[PDB]
């Protein structure tokens, strides 16, 4: 149900067993988990300028 766009890469975060996704200071989504692999993946915006 969480929609968006960006680049998905592996990160080193350590989520608790009841955590699903994390947010930064400005309350933007930067990390999610695979519902079928339970790994930690970071989200980065695509290039622009």
């Amino acid at each position: 149900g969480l929609t968006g766009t960006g680049v998905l890469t592996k990160s080193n975060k350590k989520f608790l067993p009841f955590q699903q996704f994390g947010r930064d200071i400005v309350d933007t989504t930067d990390a999610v988990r695979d519902p079928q692999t339970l790994e930690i993946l970071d989200i980065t915006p695509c290039s622009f300028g």
Binding site: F18, Q19, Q20, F21, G22, R23
Partner: peptide, 26 residues
């Protein structure tokens, strides 16, 4: 049987800050 071995003491504690829980899963 009506085994009522407990009563209301109305006593409390003034050195507790324990009522904290996680509000969400973020």
């Amino acid at each position: 049987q009506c085994v009522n071995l407990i009563t209301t003491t109305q006593s409390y504690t003034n050195s507790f800050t324990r009522g904290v829980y996680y509000p969400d899963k973020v």
